[PDB]
Amino acid sequence: MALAVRVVYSGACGYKPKYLQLKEKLEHEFPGCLDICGEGTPQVTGFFEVTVAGKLVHSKKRGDGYVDTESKFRKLVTAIKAALAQCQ
């Protein structure tokens, strides 16, 4: 199968490029083998909660940050590469 990725977020302006510079990476890395979308509910705030096939990989709400460093982005790139080669 392909694989579905998500980011739940609070739309405090600016969100499109903030998404894409991660999103337009993960799709560049793994095209057509993968999806990423975003489902940003209101009432919730201060967050960026990242999931693949119903499995959390990142939590701005638990205090994981955003992908604030190379080594933190590379966590995702490594895990999503591995999860791809399973679902393929």
From Swiss-Prot:
Top-level taxon of the source organism: Eukaryota
Q: Which Gene3D superfamilies match?
A: Glutaredoxin (3.40.30.10)
Q: Where is this cross-link: Cysteinyl-selenocysteine (Cys-Sec)?
A: S10-C13
Residues annotated as carrying S-glutathionyl cysteine in the record are C37
Q: Which InterPro entries match?
A: Selenoprotein_Rdx-typ (IPR011893), SelW_related (IPR051441), Thioredoxin-like_sf (IPR036249)
Name the principal localization, coarsely classed: cytoplasm
What processes in GO biological process is this protein linked to? erythrocyte differentiation; response to lipopolysaccharide; response to stress
- GO cellular component annotations of the record: cytoplasm; plasma membrane
Cite the GO molecular-function annotations of the record: antioxidant activity; oxidoreductase activity
Subunit organization: Interacts with DPYSL2, PRDX1, YWHAB, YWHAG, HSP70 and HSP90.
- Family indicated by similarity: Belongs to the SelWTH family. Selenoprotein W subfamily.
Q: Which PANTHER family match?
A: SELENOPROTEIN W
Role description: Plays a role as a glutathione (GSH)-dependent antioxidant. May be involved in a redox-related process. May play a role in the myopathies of selenium deficiency.
UniProt protein name: Selenoprotein W
